[PDB]
Structure 1
Amino acid sequence: GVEIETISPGDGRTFPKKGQTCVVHYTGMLQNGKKFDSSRDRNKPFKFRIGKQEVIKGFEEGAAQMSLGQRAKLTCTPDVAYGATGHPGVIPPNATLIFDVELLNLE
């Protein structure tokens, strides 16, 4: 269950497709918790492509549902990212994930 709440401005038309490498200033957040990840800190804005299952499943669907300039707000279920396992030391098991995602991409 990918739930999008978009900070509006952008174009609303340039959508990510297969074989396209897209650039995201992502920012993680734990529900009722603190931060765990921020692309803003390293200032290297995470160039990644679509269709190789590089990212988790919750981030993968929500990345396609944006456009250039937009700014969404993910709400990922536990079963699509880590909720059975939990990323060791970083994500506890059965966790619900929140992301500030801005799509400023190419291609």
Structure 2
Amino acid sequence: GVEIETISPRTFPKKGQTCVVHYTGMLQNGKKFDSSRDRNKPFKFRIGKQEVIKGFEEGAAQMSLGQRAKLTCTPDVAYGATGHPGVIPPNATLIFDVELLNL
């Protein structure tokens, strides 16, 4: 049930290539469990490395250069039964506002 809602919008990410993006997480209650903008550090990851949750990768695969979108991820594709102890509660969704700013 993954959905992508474009926020203020064609360069699709290549397979096995790194893409930097400043993403922000949000829960239904309203608490910020992570914030890349507050850390002031650009996050980098690889698609083929499979080091990130499947929901974030699936949302970034459909994104484009210079465009942000609320990537609503399914509970199973990201922390299905358990996640980080104390950060994400079990049986809960995870909304990531990915803002792809790759080169």
On whether the aligned pair clears a TM of 0.5, the verdict is yes
Structure 1 runs of 4+ with >2 Å offset: none
SS in 2 for 1:72: strand
Shift of 1:18: 1.0
Shift of 1:87: 1.9
Contact 1:86 1:94 survives alignment (8 Å): no
Q: Distance in 2 between matches of 1:33 and 1:8?
A: 22
Is structure 2 residue 85 aligned with structure 1 residue 104? no
- CA displacement, residues 35-90 of structure 1 (integer Å, 9 cap, x when unaligned): 10010011111011111111101101000001101111111111111131132110
Shift of 1:33: 3.1
Q: Distance in 1 between matches of 2:17 and 2:35?
A: 23
- Paired residue for 1:95, among 89, 92, 97? 92
Structure-2 residue corresponding to 1:20:
17
Q: Distance in 2 between matches of 1:90 and 1:47?
A: 21
SS in 2 for 1:78: coil
Contact 1:78 1:97 survives alignment (8 Å): yes
TM-score (norm 1): 0.90
TM-score (norm 2): 0.93
The gaps in structure 1 that reach 5 residues or longer are: none
- CA displacement, residues 8-41 of structure 1 (integer Å, 9 cap, x when unaligned): 32xxx11111121101110011122311001001
Q: Provide the aligned length of Structure 1 versus Structure 2.
A: 103
SS in 1 for 2:7: coil
Root mean square deviation, CA, Å: 1.1
